[PDB]
Amino acid sequence: HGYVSAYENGVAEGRATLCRVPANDTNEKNTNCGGIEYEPQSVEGPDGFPETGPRDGKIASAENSLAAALDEQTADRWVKRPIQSGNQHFEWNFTANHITKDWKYYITKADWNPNQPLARDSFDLNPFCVVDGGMVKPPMRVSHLCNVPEREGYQVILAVWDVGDTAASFYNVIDVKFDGDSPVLPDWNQGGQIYPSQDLNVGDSVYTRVFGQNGENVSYSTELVIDSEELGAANNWSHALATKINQEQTMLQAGQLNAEGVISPIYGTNPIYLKQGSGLKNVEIDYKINSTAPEYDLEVYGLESEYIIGDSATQLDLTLEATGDIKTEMTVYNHHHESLSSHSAELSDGQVEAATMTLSKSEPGHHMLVVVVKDQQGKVIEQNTLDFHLIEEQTPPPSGEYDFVFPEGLNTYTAGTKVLASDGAVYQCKEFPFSGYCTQWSPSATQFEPGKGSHWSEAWNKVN
Amino acid sequence: HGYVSAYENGVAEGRATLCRVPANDTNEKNTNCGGIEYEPQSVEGPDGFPETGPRDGKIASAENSLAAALDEQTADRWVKRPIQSGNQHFEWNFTANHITKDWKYYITKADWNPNQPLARDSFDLNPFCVVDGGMVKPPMRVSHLCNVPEREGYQVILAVWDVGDTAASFYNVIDVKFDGDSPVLPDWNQGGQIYPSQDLNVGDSVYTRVFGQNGENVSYSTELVIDSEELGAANNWSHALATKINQEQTMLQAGQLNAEGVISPIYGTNPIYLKQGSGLKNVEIDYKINSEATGDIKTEMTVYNHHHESLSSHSAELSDGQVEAATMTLSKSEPGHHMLVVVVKDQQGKVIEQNTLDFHL
Ligand SMILES: [Cu+2]
Ligand SMILES: [Cu+2]
């Protein structure tokens, strides 16, 4: 397992890598990558490319469901890293340095289509770089000096790591940009981004906060009012805000550079550029959450003040009153802040569902029931922590002239425990620190036995 | 706008920072932070702490709805960074360096309850560190030397950036771990993590791939079948997989280091530890997904022109068999080659297929 990285001399991070690790200099990150954002080292698929490997359209994901989002291909879907012709360092970062057959790097054809899914027809199937792995393990991080062909604009490099001891290969497509000469818009500098950060509701609004020579200046501010359910989609209002920004402002434009070096809004992350000589240096995004919010609440009934440790694991029998459409999460912690139980529940408004929690450990002491209340969209609304205790079963009141018939209950003998011995007499366990000897007995080691052991004089005392 | 970071001499990143930027050495990240993960520099709220400002239970979010997820407080919700007593360097990374009044740092009381929402009663309101801002703009990245008080175990440091040109401050809680000097579990070393990477469905499964001296060895593998809708929740099968790993394997254990130091599975990110001398090197996680509109789909369509510029869009969450009507208007009706990209996802948002049709005007 491993991914194309740029922690050292690497020229560009892979697409899946940028789903988790911000870019080397621009601090950019790919958006909406699915599960692969947690494990970018896992873009693994059948080997044999290009003859028989991942089928067309599934190259970027290597047919792995975890990385299926990477298979989307448009001119502005992915962060593009700058690259130059000629020799470049391609860096791999491994979490499991498998025995390697070889590495191979393919670049798209000069006139490839970026709005078409990645296919064999899109690439120069003759790799521009091959590194014999030698069927040995590499270091946990390696780099390959590769002669990158001459290109222009948006290109994609496919880095294939052929694992030597499996039938699989790791595929990492890389979104690169061949700029070089002709600096694209030298009079415009990026100072912010419109990330599709969240979905918004009707009544909400998203607006910009431009930072210049005199702090924030609301003359350049743009506000977009979410007036439709479809405009609430993170990609939608990001495109609309960038569009409204370009209508109302002149010293700043929002959107991705297209093939003509013209800033055009996209349905994703829209960078914000600042005109040189305007004094602007940074733009940030803010939100007005003015949509009518229901009065969310959760009521937990049935939590006893004390729970007696019984035969089985202690059990919480609770019921929940849900005010508003909420999503609840409950967890049980003990005296030492250790998790013992959990219960998720996507309740509706007014729904009275039953909850039942089993403690993984039923030990005495202070316990806590943490209750996290979210809405149907997952926003944390409130947290409440209720207290309760677990107690050991109360010993019965003392009765008779002793407590056990030796050796019954040998494990519980403490300072003052009276026992009946085989000689018909009563012996009391001596106090500190001799009470530890009252527990040591076995049919083989019969010392400390009251009336029979050779050393019971130090452990027990005959009662009268 | 800015956040507590550790790009240079910073001793520990802030909680919101770890929602976006991996840890310095451990590569860890906080999970399920909401929209704040895109903009960790935006945890901004009213000033005046602790007399006024963010109310109790909203300190970590500064009452910003964008950062509402940070207000949850349990013993194992957040990634904790090791720290020591005495003088330590705390680093701020600014995206907009506002005129600054001061920076103030507060640390939780020694016997604070990490399962209670963060409140003023949780913190020592006498700040252990105050840095003058001088009502001037700071550099784009600064560090402050602060005398961190002696603590043990899980603590939280609140870093307050009070800017001078607004009535707002930036609040960054920092999850720290006073590990002392005795290394906990020297015969155990982390070699993988179980991230709550996705929700699973009934019939799916999740399993481990244990990399050792001779590649992957399936004798060490553990598999968890998702047999109920509740177990399909990411935090649910993560904890269950970590639990099942501990039942079946002796050379590797899964879970966090609790207050008792033992490896205990949590309902979040579970690191996987490897017994020193076992030969194991790394553990990865894999998934079996064994569970005109054909099927319940969610579609996304976009129009591109000759020069790869977006001109129209149309989302539609169709059902099975539903034949709905679509209407797209081009923002530019110019001659040349055009493309219509059609992205096919499922009701859960997983990309299934993309088709690009060609046409001319
Ligand atoms: Cu691997
Ligand atoms: Cu700011």
Pick from A25, A38, A361, A372 the residue to mutate for testing the B interface (most B CBs within 10 Å).
A38
CB contact set of A123 (below 8 Å; sequence gap of 6+): A50, A106, A107, A108, A109, A112, A156, A158
Cα distance between residue B174 and residue B79, in whole Å = 9
Q: Is the distance from CB of B110 to CB of B151 less than 8 angstroms?
A: yes
CB contact set of A105 (below 8 Å; sequence gap of 6+): A90, A127, A128, A129, A130, A144, A146, A157, A158, A159, A160
The reply to whether B313 falls in a domain is no
Residue A279 contacts B where some CB pair is shorter than 8 Å: no
Residue A22 contacts B where some CB pair is shorter than 8 Å: yes
At B174, give phi and psi (nearest 5°).
-125, 125
Cα distance between residue A218 and residue A220, in whole Å = 5
CATH number at residue A363: 2.60.40.2550
User: Both A152 and A52 in a single domain?
Assistant: yes
Q: Is the distance from CB of A346 to CB of A356 less than 8 angstroms?
A: no
Residue tagged 């989302």 (tokens): B315
Q: What DSSP character marks residue B15? A: H
Q: At which of A270, A288, A306 does a domain end?
A: A288
User: Both B143 and B217 in a single domain?
Assistant: no
Provide the number of structural domains found in chain B: 2
Q: Kindly give the distance from the C-alpha atom of residue B98 to the centroid of ligand 2, in angstroms, as a whole number.
A: 6
Cα distance between residue A249 and residue A233, in whole Å = 24
> How was it solved?
X-ray
Cα distance between residue B40 and residue A400, in whole Å = 70
Residue tagged 């990634």 (tokens): B79
Cα distance between residue A45 and residue A54, in whole Å = 7
Residue A56 contacts B where some CB pair is shorter than 8 Å: no
Q: Residues 114 to 153 of B: which have CB under 8 A from any A CB?
A: 114-117
Question: In whole angstroms, how large is the CA radius of gyration of chain A?
Answer: 34
The reply to whether B303 falls in a domain is no
Cα distance between residue B198 and residue B217, in whole Å = 25
What six digits make up the tokens of A148?
């990158």
Q: Three-state DSSP class for A9?
A: coil
Q: What DSSP character marks residue A244? A: H
User: Both B89 and B20 in a single domain?
Assistant: yes
Q: Residues 333 to 372 of A: which have CB under 8 A from any B CB?
A: 333, 336-339, 342, 344, 368, 370, 372
Cβ-count burial of A9 within 10 angstroms (0-12 exposed, 13-18 middle, 19+ buried)?
Answer: exposed
Cα distance between residue B155 and residue B84, in whole Å = 11
User: Both A257 and A306 in a single domain?
Assistant: no
Q: Three-state DSSP class for A410?
A: helix
Q: Which residues of A340-350 are buried (b: 16+ CB within 10 A; e: fewer)?
A: bbbbbbbbeee
The reply to whether A415 falls in a domain is no
Bridge partners (DSSP) listed for residue A125: none
Q: Is the distance from CB of B308 to CB of A258 less than 8 angstroms?
A: yes
User: Both B199 and B138 in a single domain?
Assistant: no
CATH number at residue B126: 2.70.50.50
Range of the domain at A387: 297-391
Q: Is the distance from CB of B281 to CB of A96 less than 8 angstroms?
A: yes
Residue A207 contacts B where some CB pair is shorter than 8 Å: no
Parallel, antiparallel or unpaired: strands A263-264 and A168-178: unpaired
User: Both A163 and A257 in a single domain?
Assistant: no
Cα distance between residue A294 and residue A298, in whole Å = 13
Residue tagged 């890598």 (tokens): A17
Neighbours of B270 (CB within 10 A): 28
User: Both B31 and B173 in a single domain?
Assistant: yes
Ordered DSSP codes for B178-230: E--SS-S-TTEEEEEEE-------TT-EEEEEEEETTEE-GGG--EEE--STT
At A235, give phi and psi (nearest 5°).
-70, -25
Half-sphere exposure of A290 (CA within 13 A, CB side): 11
Q: At which of B262, B288, B314 does a domain end?
A: B288
Q: Residues 309 to 328 of B: which have CB under 8 A from any A CB?
A: 309-310, 313, 315
User: Both B265 and B233 in a single domain?
Assistant: yes
What six digits make up the tokens of B281?
């090197």
CA dihedral A61, A67, A68, A72 (to 10 degrees): -70
Cα distance between residue B361 and residue B359, in whole Å = 7
- Chain breaks of chain B after residues with C–N above 2.5 Å: 291
The reply to whether A284 falls in a domain is yes
Ligand approaching nearest to the C-alpha of B100: 2
What six digits make up the tokens of A422?
């085989």
The reply to whether B271 falls in a domain is yes
Residue B166 contacts A where some CB pair is shorter than 8 Å: yes
- How many CB pairs below 8 A link A and B? 201
Ordered DSSP codes for A75-123: TTSS--EEE-SEEEEEEEEESS---EEEEEEEEB-TT--TTS---GGGB
CA angle A131, A135, A138 (to 5 degrees): 70
Q: Is the distance from CB of B107 to CB of B123 less than 8 angstroms?
A: yes
Sort residue B134 into left (φ over 0), alpha (ψ -120 to 50) or beta: left
CB contact under 8 A, A379 and B34: yes
Sort residue A302 into left (φ over 0), alpha (ψ -120 to 50) or beta: left
What six digits make up the tokens of B129?
């560190």
Q: At which of B178, B198, B233 does a domain end?
A: B178
Identity at A90, one-letter amino acid code: F
Residue B230 contacts A where some CB pair is shorter than 8 Å: yes
User: Both B246 and B160 in a single domain?
Assistant: no
At A305, give phi and psi (nearest 5°).
-70, -35
User: Both B109 and B211 in a single domain?
Assistant: no
Cα distance between residue A160 and residue B167, in whole Å = 53
The reply to whether B334 falls in a domain is no
CATH number at residue B225: 3.30.70.2150
Neighbours of B248 (CB within 10 A): 12
The reply to whether A436 falls in a domain is no
Residues on chain A touching B140 (C-beta within 8 angstroms): none
User: Both A66 and A122 in a single domain?
Assistant: yes
At B351, give phi and psi (nearest 5°).
-65, 125
User: Both B135 and B211 in a single domain?
Assistant: no
The reply to whether A359 falls in a domain is yes
CB contact set of B356 (below 8 Å; sequence gap of 6+): A113, A115, A116, A117, B339, B340, B341, B342
Distances (CA, A) of A310 to A305, A361, A393, B282: 16, 12, 7, 41
Q: Is the distance from CB of A21 to CB of A13 less than 8 angstroms?
A: yes
Q: Kindly give the distance from the C-alpha atom of residue A73 to the centroid of ligand 1, in angstroms, as a whole number.
A: 26
CB contact under 8 A, B315 and A265: no
- Residue whose C-alpha is closest to residue B281's, from B218, B193, B213: B213
- Residue whose C-alpha is closest to residue B106's, from B44, B158, B172: B158
Residue A260 contacts B where some CB pair is shorter than 8 Å: yes
- Residue whose C-alpha is closest to residue A373's, from A314, A292, A294, A316: A294
